[PDB]
Amino acid sequence: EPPTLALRLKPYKTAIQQLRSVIRALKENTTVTFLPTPSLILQTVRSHCVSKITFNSSCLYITDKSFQPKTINNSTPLLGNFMYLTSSKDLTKFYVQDISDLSAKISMCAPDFNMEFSSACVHGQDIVRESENSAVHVDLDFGVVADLLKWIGPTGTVQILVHAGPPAIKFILTNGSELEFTSNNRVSFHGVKNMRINVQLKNFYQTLLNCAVTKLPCTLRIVTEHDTLLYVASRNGLFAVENFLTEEP
């Protein structure tokens, strides 16, 4: 039996339903990485934004740890959106086998059906990762995230201003409207530094929506180790949603 990575259906099904919106909107700029951890990472790449969804160990089962990491594009030659297909309510078994170093053999089952598909592997795919520490790090209650979404929602940029002492975070719109959160029971400020970044409103809003699916707190960090990036993430017991946005001039 070749190294096999299987999905534990109960939690995996719960997970994709919460991510339905995200999964359904995936296009051609997304990769799926299967790791022997076990782990499943979906990474969507845009010019100034990288979105990543990581399913944790509780959603997977791995037999043999010699399973070589496998990466494929989500846009499959005849089936189209791969992850969307795994969201089918009929799915009863889903597993990936490491037969060749060149492809991933994916098997799926449903009541009186079974299917197998071999997808060529992508080599050297770069996966964006959250930095150890950073210039700014704030945690926000889900309710704060909801406030931000409500305030922004139905091009342009949004300025994110962070203040030292007392700690504070402000979101500024081009029209001179500002939403601020001071240190209190709804937001925890770990690392703070006086700085202001500018990000694309659309990607920022989209990032907040992606994180909101957890209905749990979010983390916002501004990293300056290299080029300035804004990091917005949230997680639950099944997956973690992470987004990295670059600055707009």
Binding site: P69, G124, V128
Partner: peptide, 20 residues
């Protein structure tokens, strides 16, 4: 290497094989 990242993201990335 399928999806290329803009230069700004490269230093914050690692190869899928050295991932967790």
């Amino acid at each position: 290497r399928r999806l290329h990242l803009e230069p700004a993201f490269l230093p914050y990335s690692v190869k899928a094989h050295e991932c967790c």
